[PDB]
Design a protein around this ligand. Structure first.
Ligand SMILES: CCC1=C(C)/C(=C/C2=NC(=C\c3[nH]c(/C=C4\NC(=O)[C@H](C)[C@H]4CC)c(C)c3CCC(=O)O)/C(CCC(=O)O)=C2C)NC1=O
Ligand SMILES: CCC1=C(C)/C(=C/C2=NC(=C\c3[nH]c(/C=C4\NC(=O)[C@H](C)[C@H]4CC)c(C)c3CCC(=O)O)/C(CCC(=O)O)=C2C)NC1=O
Ligand SMILES: CCC1=C(C)/C(=C/C2=NC(=C\c3[nH]c(/C=C4\NC(=O)[C@H](C)[C@H]4CC)c(C)c3CCC(=O)O)/C(CCC(=O)O)=C2C)NC1=O
Ligand SMILES: CCC1=C(C)/C(=C/C2=NC(=C\c3[nH]c(/C=C4\NC(=O)[C@H](C)[C@H]4CC)c(C)c3CCC(=O)O)/C(CCC(=O)O)=C2C)NC1=O
Ligand SMILES: CCC1=C(C)/C(=C/C2=NC(=C\c3[nH]c(/C=C4\NC(=O)[C@H](C)[C@H]4CC)c(C)c3CCC(=O)O)/C(CCC(=O)O)=C2C)NC1=O
Ligand SMILES: CCC1=C(C)/C(=C/C2=NC(=C\c3[nH]c(/C=C4\NC(=O)[C@H](C)[C@H]4CC)c(C)c3CCC(=O)O)/C(CCC(=O)O)=C2C)NC1=O
Ligand SMILES: CCC1=C(C)/C(=C/C2=NC(=C\c3[nH]c(/C=C4\NC(=O)[C@H](C)[C@H]4CC)c(C)c3CCC(=O)O)/C(CCC(=O)O)=C2C)NC1=O
Ligand SMILES: CCC1=C(C)/C(=C/C2=NC(=C\c3[nH]c(/C=C4\NC(=O)[C@H](C)[C@H]4CC)c(C)c3CCC(=O)O)/C(CCC(=O)O)=C2C)NC1=O
Ligand SMILES: CCC1=C(C)/C(=C/C2=NC(=C\c3[nH]c(/C=C4\NC(=O)[C@H](C)[C@H]4CC)c(C)c3CCC(=O)O)/C(CCC(=O)O)=C2C)NC1=O
Ligand SMILES: CCC1=C(C)/C(=C/C2=NC(=C\c3[nH]c(/C=C4\NC(=O)[C@H](C)[C@H]4CC)c(C)c3CCC(=O)O)/C(CCC(=O)O)=C2C)NC1=O
Lengths: 162, 202, 172, 69, 172, 162, 172, 162, 162, 163
C-alpha cells in the first residue's frame, strides 16, 4: 500500500537513485511517531464495541427519518450493515495509524467511494457524522500524540467522504 | 477527471492542412520509430533524440539521464509513448521546465514538445492549464500523450517531432525559462560582492 | 518553489558566502516553530470543503448578480469552476503556509491569473472578495484552540493572513 | 503507482488478425506495418483503457498473464 | 509495493480481524529498531560504488573468460551493462533492507530478470557469484563501527544475508 | 533548491492534492532534525580556513605530481582556484545541512559535474581526496548527531563525484 | 535549407530560366575546390574540443564576472550549458562551411537567438566574445598543414571567418 | 532542397553531432560526381529547344486524338502550354543534374503533381511519353557517366509520373 | 555493426522504399574507398607489436607517476592489461578501416566507454595519448589515402576518448 | 458548442477532413423531420411552465416532509424561491433540448458540474429527481403521441444524470 517509507522507496525508485539524507530523515521521523500511533491503534482497538454502537445511534439521532419505515435504514440487516460499515471504517483508521500513512484507508475505503455511494444510494453524510461522533469520543479516549494521529486520520477520512 | 474542458477554438496552422508533401525533404523532421530500437547505436540515437525533443539538448546531462526508462526501452517492455510520458513525469522535467514557467508557458512548451505544434491561441493555454491547476502536470502529461491528437499524429511507436518545416525549430524560440528573475542569478547591472580569492593583474 | 531555508541559501550563495550566525538563528527558530506551523497547515487542509462552502455562501449571498442568468457563475459548469478555483487557491495557500515562503503561491498560482480571468470575462474583484471570505473562514479554523496544545500562534495567523491578502491583491 | 494498484502489472499478447488489418487498410497506415504478435506489458492502472484501445483497434488478444501475483 | 507493516496489515485484513497484541508488539519492536536499520541502509548507500567496484574486481579476478573476446561482458557496452546490473541489484537490496519486506525487491527488480538473462544468453551463475561478492563487501562495510555508536546488529546482518541470498536464488 | 518541504509540496502538487498526514510527518521529521543539522553547519562555518587549507594540502600530498610545473596544480592561480573549489564544496555541504536536503549540492555542484570536469580536464579524484580529508576532520570537529549529518552529506558528494 | 547549388537553382527558378553557362562554371569551380573545403570542415570537426576549451579558457580569463557566484556560468549546470552553446555554434559553422551557404545558421541556429538569450538573461556580448574566441582558435587549426598536402586556401579562411562573424553579429 | 550535402547536414544535426567520416566521404563523392552531371546539364541546356519541340511532337504522335478539336491538346494556346510544360520538366531535370540530387524535382514538379494533374485533367501519360522521348535523345547527346546521370534523373521523373 | 551499406539498407527499409539514387551512389563511393582502406588495414596489422610496445612506454613517458607503487600503472599484470587494451584499440581501428565506417569502433569501444572508465578509474588521457602515438607512427607507416583514412579513424577514436 | 445532430455531423466530417457524405445528410433530414413534434412539445411545455413548477415544488415537499421543519434546507421563504427557480431552470433546459433536438442544453447547462455543486451546497439529488418525475407525470397529460415520447426522453435523461 502507501506509507511514509513506501513513498520514500517509491520516490527513490522514480528518481532512480540510492536512498539519501532527505528520505532517511523522513524514515526516522516516521519511526519516532511509530509508537504513539501504535498506542493510538491499541486504544482505539480496545473500545471498538462501544464506538460502533455510539456511531450508529448517533447516525440515527442525526437523521431521524432514515429509521422510519419505507426508508433505507429500516431493517435489522440494514442495521447490521451500519455496524459493519463503521467497523470497517475504524478498522482502516487503525491500519492507517499502524502504517503511519493513509495508504490502507485510501486503498480500502477512498478508492471508488463516490460511485459506490451513488449506485447503492448511500448518503455520505451518514458516514461523515458517524466519523464526527467517533472523532468526538476519541477527543476523550486519547490525549497527546496518539490523539493527534487519530484525529488527523479521522478528519482525512471525513474529507474524503465529503 | 472533473469538469469538461472549454472549446478548442482552432486556428489556421500548417499541420491542420498537410495533405501535400512539405517543401524540403531534408527539412522534414526525422520520424523515429520502433525499428530504430533494435540496434544499439540506433537505440542511442533514439534516446538522444527523445532527450532533445523533450528536454531540449541543454538538459542532456549525466545527472538528468533517466537510466531506468532507457533500460526498459532497451528491453522492449516500454512503448515510445510510455518513454515520452515518463520523461514528462520526471523530477528533472518538473524542476527545470514546470517550475520557472507559469501554467500557461508550461502548457505552450508541452504543446511544442509533445505535440509538435505551437498553440492555436492563448485560449488553448487557458483551457489546458486547468488540468495542471486541478490535477498536476502528471495528469496533464497523461492527457496530452493519451489524447486524440497525439494518437493521430504519432501513435504508440513514433517519437514526437515538430510538425513544422524545421527551418524554424521550436527549441530555439522557446527556452525553458523566459523573462523571469532567477533567485540563483544576479541582475545584469549588479556586481559580485564577495571574496576575490586572487589578484590576477587587476 | 523555495521555502525559507532555500531562500536564505540562495541569498547567501548570491553573496558568495556561508550563512551568517544570525541567519542560522532565524532558521533554527523557524524549525522550532515548525510544529505549530504543521498544526496550522493541517487545520487548513482538514477543513478545506467547509472553508470553501462558507466562502461560497457568503459570496453569493452578497453578490447575487453572479448566480443570475448572464452572470459569470450561472450554469452548473461555471459554479463548479468557481468552487474549483477557490479550492486551488486554498491549496496553494496551504503549501505556502507550510513552506513559510510565498514563492510557491506566486509562481504556481497567482503569476498569470488576473489576465486569465480577464480573458475569461471574470470579475476579478469578485474573485478577490472570495479569497477574503476564504481567509475569514480559514482564520476561524486556524484559531481553534480545541484539540491542540494551547500556545502563541499570532505569527502563524499573520503569515496566513498575508498569503490570503497577497493572493487577493495579485488577482485584483 | 505507489499503491497496490500500481503493482500487479499484466502482460498482454495481441494478435493483429484480419479484422485489425481491414480497419488499418480502410483508415490508412500512419506508421510502417509490424509483425502479427507481440507481448505488451501494462500496469493495472492502464489495464482497462488499454483493452478498450485494442478492442477499438479491432485487434484480437491471444494471451494475458499477471507478471505480479 | 509493501513493507513489513503493510504485510501484517495485509494478513490482518485478509482475516478480517484487527491487529493482535502479538502482532502490534512485534511491529513496535521493529519500529524502535528503525533507527537501528537506517544506519545499515546508510552504510549500504554511502559505500555502494566501493562495494560494486570491489565486487567487480573480484568477479573478474576469479573468472577471466568473461572479459575474454567472445565473452559475455567483453565489449564496453556489455561491461557497462554488468556494472549497471550490480548497481541496480545493490540498490534494490538496500531498498528491501530499509523496507524490512521482500515484496518491493521481488516484485520490481527480481520479477523478470532471470527470463531476460536467459533470453540474452548471459550466464546467471556468474551473476550469482557477483551478488555473493557484493554480499561479502556489504558485510565488510556494514560491520564497520566507525562514526556510529556501538551496538548489537545481528538481526540486521541476518536479514540482509537472507535478502542477498534470496536475490541470488531468484537470479539463479 | 530541493529539501524535504519542497519534495513534499512538489509531490502534493503533481497529484493536485492537499498535504495529507504522511507529508506532515515527513515535515516534522525534518523540523526535529534541523537542530543538529544547523549545529553542524555552524561548526563547519566556524572552521572555514583550517578545513579548506587542510583539504588543499591533502590533495597535494596524495597527488604530489600535480604541483609540478606543466601540470594543473602548478602556479598561484591554479592553487587559488583549488582553494576556491574546495570552499565551494564546503559551502554547499553546509547549505545542504541547513536545508536538510541534498538539493543545494545536487543543483549547484552535481548537476553538470561530469561535463565541466571533462571539459576542463579536472580530475574527480582530487575532490574525492579533499572531501575524504574534510570527512576525517569532521569527526574531530563534530560529535553526536551533527557529525552523522555532515558525514551523510559529504558522503553524498563523494558518491556523486565517483 | 540551401547549399550553394540549391541557392543558384532557386535564383534561376525565380528568373524562370535555365542555368547560365557562367553559373555552371562557378558551381564547377566550387565542386573542384570541395576537397579543400572538406579538409577545412574536418579540421574544425577533429579539433572541436580544443577550440571550445581554448575559447572557454580565454573567455573566463577575460570575464571573471561570469564565473563568480550569481554569474551566468557560475553553477556547473550553467557552465555546461555555456560549453554546449559553444559547441552548437561551432557545429553549425562547420555545417555552413561544408554547404558553402550560411543558410543553416540563419534557419536553425540564429533565427531568434538574441531574443532567446534576452529571455534567459544571458549577456549577449559575452556570447559574441565566445564566438570570436572560437574563430581565433579555429583559424589556427584550419591553417595547420600537418598530414595534408600544402595548397592555397585563403578563400576558405575568409569563408570560415565570415561565418563566425555572421554568427557573432546575429547573436550580439 | 534534398541534396547529398544537405542530407549530410540534416543527418548530422538530427543526432546533434559533427560531420563524421562517412558523411564527408559522401560529400566528397558528390564533389567528384559534379563534373559529369554539370557537363550533362550544360549539354541539355544547349539542346533545350530541339528537345522540347520534339517532345511535343512525340506527345502529339502517340496521342493523336488530343490534337483533334474538342480534346485537351487542340488549340494554339494548349500547344504553347505543351512547350511550356515540357520546358519546365527539362529545366528541372537540369536543375537536378546540377544539384546532384532529385531535390529540385521533388521540390517543384513531383510534390503535388498527382492532384494538380487530376484537377486540371492533365493525363500523366502525355508527360511520360515526352520524357521517354527526351530519354531517347539524351542517349545520343551524352555518353558515359553523364548519360547515366541524365537517364537517372529522367527515370526518376518517369517513376514519379507513373 | 554499422556501415555505409548498413545505413543505406536500414534507411531504405525504414521508409519501405527502394534504394534511390543517393543511396546507390554513396555505396558506389564506398566501393571505390574500399581499395585504400584494406591496404591501410594490412599495413596496420603488420606492425601491431611494435606499435603496442611503443605506445605503452609513450604512456609511461608522459605519465611517469602511474608506475610508482600504489598507482594504476604499477604492476606487471596491470601493464599486461594495458598492452591488451592497446591491442584492442588497434584491432578495432583496423576493423573500422575495413568496414569503411566507425560503426565497429563505435559499437565496440564508444558504447558505454565513459562509465566503464569511471568504474575502474582508468584515466582516459592515457588512451588519448596512446592513440596519439599510434597516429604519429601511422603518419610514417602509411602513405596517401590509406594514411588519411587511418588518421581520420584514429582522430575519431581520440575525440571519443576526450 | 452544443452537441446536437447537425453539430455532430459537421464535427465528424471535419475530423475526417471530408465533405458531408449522404449518411450525414440522412441524419440531418431525420432531425429536420423530428423537429416538428419537438417544437410542439416545447410549446406545450413552455406554455404550462408555471403549473408544472408549482406542482413540482409541492410534490417534492410531499415526498420529503423532513426538509420543511426548522434546521433543514427547505425551511425558509428564500429557499422556497430557490426551489421554484431551480425547477424552472430544469424545465427551461428541457424545453431548450427539445428545440435543439438533442441533449446539448442539458449536458452543457445542468449536467456538467452537477455533482460538485450539489455536494458543495449539500443539495440532495433526490429532490430534483422527485420534481422531474412529477413533471414527467404531468407532461404525460399535457402532451400526446410523438411529442409526449420526445419530451419524456429528455426528462428521463435529466433524471438519469441526476442519479
Ligand atoms: C493554479 C492557478 C490557476 C487557477 C486558479 C486557474 C483558474 C481557471 N479558471 C478558469 C475559468 C473560471 N473561473 C471561474 C471563477 C470565477 N467565477 C465566479 O464568478 C467567481 C467570482 C470566481 C471564483 C471565485 C469561473 C466561473 C470560470 C468558468 C468560465 C467559463 O466556464 O467560461 C479557467 C479556465 C477554464 C476551465 O477550463 O474551467 C482556469 C484555468 N488557472 C490556473 O493556472
Ligand atoms: C502529523 C502532523 C503533526 C501534528 C498534527 C502535530 C501537532 C503538535 N502540536 C504540538 C504542540 C503545539 N501545537 C500548537 C498549535 C496551537 N496553538 C494554538 O492553539 C493554535 C490554535 C494552534 C495552531 C494554529 C502549539 C502553539 C504548540 C506548542 C509548541 C511548543 O511547545 O513549542 C506538538 C508537540 C507536543 C508538545 O509540545 O507538548 C505536536 C506533535 N505535529 C505534527 O508533526
Ligand atoms: C572492448 C575493448 C575493451 C577495452 C578497451 C577494455 C579496457 C579495460 N581494461 C580493463 C583492466 C585494466 N586496464 C588497465 C590499463 C591502465 N593501467 C596501465 O596499465 C595503463 C597506463 C593503462 C592502459 C593505457 C588497468 C589498470 C586495468 C585494471 C583496473 C583495476 O583493476 O582497478 C578493464 C576492466 C576489467 C577488470 O577490471 O577486471 C577494461 C574494461 N576492455 C575491453 O573489453
Ligand atoms: C528491474 C530493474 C532493471 C534490472 C534488474 C536490469 C538488468 C538488465 N541488464 C541488462 C543487459 C546485460 N546485463 C549484463 C551483465 C552480465 N554480464 C556478465 O558478465 C555479468 C556476470 C553479468 C552482470 C552481473 C549483460 C552482458 C547485458 C547485455 C547482454 C546483451 O547485450 O546481449 C538488461 C537488458 C537491457 C539493456 O541493457 O539495454 C537489463 C534489463 N535493468 C533494469 O532496468
Ligand atoms: C539522517 C539519517 C539517520 C541516521 C544515520 C541515524 C542514525 C542513529 N543511530 C543512533 C544510535 C545507534 N545506531 C546504531 C547502529 C550501529 N551500531 C553498530 O555500530 C553498527 C555498525 C551500526 C549499525 C549499522 C545503534 C546500535 C545505536 C544505538 C541503539 C539505541 O540507541 O537504541 C541514533 C540515536 C542516538 C545518536 O546516535 O545520537 C541515530 C539518530 N538516524 C537517522 O534519522
Ligand atoms: C558550482 C561550484 C563550482 C565548482 C566546484 C567549480 C569547479 C571549477 N574549477 C575551475 C577552474 C580550476 N580548478 C582547478 C582546481 C585544481 N587546482 C589544483 O590543481 C587542485 C588539484 C585542484 C582542485 C582540488 C584548476 C587547476 C582549475 C583551472 C582549469 C583550467 O583553466 O584549465 C572551473 C573552470 C572555470 C574557471 O576558469 O575558473 C570550474 C567550473 N565551478 C563551480 O561553479
Ligand atoms: C539551434 C541551436 C541552439 C542555440 C544556439 C541555442 C542557445 C540556448 N542556450 C540555452 C541555455 C544557456 N546558454 C547559455 C550561454 C552563456 N553561457 C555564458 O554566459 C556564455 C556567455 C554564454 C555561452 C558562450 C547559458 C548560461 C544557458 C543556461 C541558462 C539557463 O539554463 O537558465 C538555451 C535555453 C535551453 C534550455 O534552458 O533548456 C538556448 C535555446 N539553443 C539552440 O537549440
Ligand atoms: C574522409 C573525407 C575526405 C577528405 C577529408 C579528403 C581530403 C583530400 N584532400 C586532398 C588534397 C588537398 N587538400 C587541400 C587543403 C589543405 N591545403 C592546406 O594548405 C590547407 C591548410 C588545407 C585546407 C584547409 C589542398 C589545397 C589539396 C590539394 C588539391 C587542390 O588544391 O585542389 C585530396 C586530393 C588527393 C591529394 O592529392 O592529396 C583529398 C581527397 N578526401 C576525402 O574523401
Ligand atoms: C512545376 C512546373 C509546372 C508544370 C510541369 C505544370 C504543368 C501545368 N500545365 C498547365 C496548363 C496545360 N497543360 C496542358 C497539357 C499539355 N498541353 C497538351 O496539349 C499536351 C498533351 C500536353 C503537353 C505534353 C494543357 C492542355 C494546359 C492548358 C489547359 C489545362 O490546364 O487544362 C497547368 C495549369 C495552369 C493553367 O494553364 O491554367 C499546369 C499546372 N505547371 C507547373 O507550374
Ligand atoms: C443551471 C441550473 C442551476 C441549478 C439547478 C442550480 C442549483 C442551485 N440552487 C442553489 C440554492 C438552493 N436551492 C435549494 C433547493 C431546495 N430547496 C428545498 O426546499 C427543495 C427540497 C429543494 C428544491 C425543490 C436550496 C435549499 C438552496 C440553498 C442552499 C444553500 O444556500 O446552502 C444554488 C446556490 C446558489 C445561491 O443560492 O447563491 C445552486 C447552484 N443552479 C443553477 O445555475
Amino acid at each position: 500500500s502507501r506509507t511514509v517509507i513506501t513513498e520514500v522507496i517509491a520516490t527513490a525508485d522514480s528518481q532512480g537513485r540510492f536512498l539519501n539524507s532527505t528520505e532517511l530523515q523522513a524514515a526516522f521521523g516516521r519511526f519516532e511517531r511509530a509508537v504513539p500511533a501504535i498506542e493510538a491503534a491499541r486504544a482505539l482497538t480496545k473500545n471498538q464495541d462501544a464506538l460502533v454502537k455510539g456511531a450508529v445511534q448517533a447516525v440515527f439521532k442525526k437523521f431521524p427519518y432514515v429509521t422510519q419505515p419505507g426508508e433505507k435504514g429500516y431493517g435489522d440487516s440494514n442495521q447490521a450493515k451500519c455496524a459493519r460499515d463503521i467497523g470497517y471504517y475504524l478498522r482502516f483508521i487503525t491500519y492507517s495509524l499502524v502504517a503511519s500513512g493513509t495508504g490502507p484507508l485510501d486503498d480500502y475505503v477512498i478508492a471508488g467511494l463516490r460511485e459506490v455511494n451513488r449506485a447503492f444510494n448511500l448518503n455520505p453524510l451518514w458516514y461523515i457524522e458517524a466519523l464526527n461522533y467517533i472523532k468526538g469520543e476519541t477527543g476523550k479516549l486519547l490525549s497527546g500524540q496518539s490523539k493527534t494521529e487519530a484525529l488527523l486520520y479521522i478528519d482525512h477520512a471525513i474529507n474524503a467522504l465529503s | 477527471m472533473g469538469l469538461p474542458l472549454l472549446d478548442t477554438k482552432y486556428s489556421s496552422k500548417p499541420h491542420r492542412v498537410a495533405s501535400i508533401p512539405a517543401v524540403n525533404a531534408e527539412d522534414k523532421p526525422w520520424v523515429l520509430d520502433r525499428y530504430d530500437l533494435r540496434d544499439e547505436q540506433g537505440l542511442q540515437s533514439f534516446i538522444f533524440a527523445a532527450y532533445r525533443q523533450i528536454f531540449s539538448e541543454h538538459l542532456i546531462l549525466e545527472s538528468n539521464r533517466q537510466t531506468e526508462l532507457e533500460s526498459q526501452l532497451r528491453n522492449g517492455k516500454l512503448l515510445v509513448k510510455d518513454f515520452v510520458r515518463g520523461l514528462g513525469k520526471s523530477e528533472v522535467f518538473r524542476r527545470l521546465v514546470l517550475e520557472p514557467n507559469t501554467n500557461y508557458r508550461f502548457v505552450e512548451i508541452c504543446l511544442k514538445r509533445f505535440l509538435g505544434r505551437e498553440p492555436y491561441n492563448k485560449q488553448e493555454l487557458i483551457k489546458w492549464s486547468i488540468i495542471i491547476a486541478e490535477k498536476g502536470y502528471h495528469a496533464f502529461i497523461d492527457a496530452v500523450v493519451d489524447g486524440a491528437e497525439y494518437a493521430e499524429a504519432f501513435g504508440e511507436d513514433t517519437l514526437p517531432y515538430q510538425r513544422r518545416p524545421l527551418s524554424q525549430p521550436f527549441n530555439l524560440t522557446t527556452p525553458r525559462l523566459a523573462d523571469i528573475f532567477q533567485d540563483d542569478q544576479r541582475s545584469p547591472w549588479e556586481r559580485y560582492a564577495g571574496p576575490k580569492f586572487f589578484v590576477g593583474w587587476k | 518553489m523555495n521555502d525559507v531555508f532555500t531562500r536564505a541559501i540562495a541569498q547567501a550563495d548570491l553573496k558568495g558566502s556561508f550563512l551568517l550566525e544570525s541567519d542560522l538563528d532565524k532558521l533554527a527558530s523557524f524549525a522550532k516553530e515548525g510544529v505549530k506551523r504543521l498544526d496550522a497547515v493541517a487545520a487548513l487542509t482538514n477543513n478545506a470543503p467547509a472553508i470553501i462552502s462558507d466562502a461560497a455562501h457568503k459570496l453569493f449571498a452578497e453578490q447575487q448578480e453572479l448566480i443570475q442568468p448572464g452572470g459569470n457563475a450561472y450554469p452548473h459548469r461555471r459554479m463548479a469552476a468557481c468552487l474549483r478555483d477557490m479550492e486551488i487557491i486554498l491549496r496553494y495557500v496551504s503549501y505556502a503556509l507550510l513552506a513559510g515562503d510565498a514563492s510557491v503561491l506566486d509562481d504556481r498560482c497567482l503569476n498569470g491569473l488576473r489576465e486569465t480571468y480577464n480573458a475569461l470575462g471574470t470579475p476579478t474583484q469578485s474573485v478577490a472578495r472570495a479569497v477574503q471570505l476564504m481567509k475569514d473562514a480559514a482564520m476561524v479554523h486556524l484559531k481553534s484552540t480545541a484539540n491542540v496544545t494551547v500556545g502563541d500562534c499570532s505569527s502563524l495567523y499573520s503569515e496566513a493572513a498575508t498569503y490570503f491578502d497577497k493572493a487577493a491583491a495579485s488577482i485584483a | 503507482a505507489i499503491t497496490t494498484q500500481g503493482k500487479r502489472i499484466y502482460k498482454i499478447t495481441v494478435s493483429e488478425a484480419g479484422a485489425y488489418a481491414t480497419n488499418k487498410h480502410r483508415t490508412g497506415y500512419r506508421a510502417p506495418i509490424r509483425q502479427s504478435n507481440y507481448t505488451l506489458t501494462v500496469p493495472y492502472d492502464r489495464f482497462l483503457p488499454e483493452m478498450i484501445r485494442l478492442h477499438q483497434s479491432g485487434a484480437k488478444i491471444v494471451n494475458v498473464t499477471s507478471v505480479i501475483s
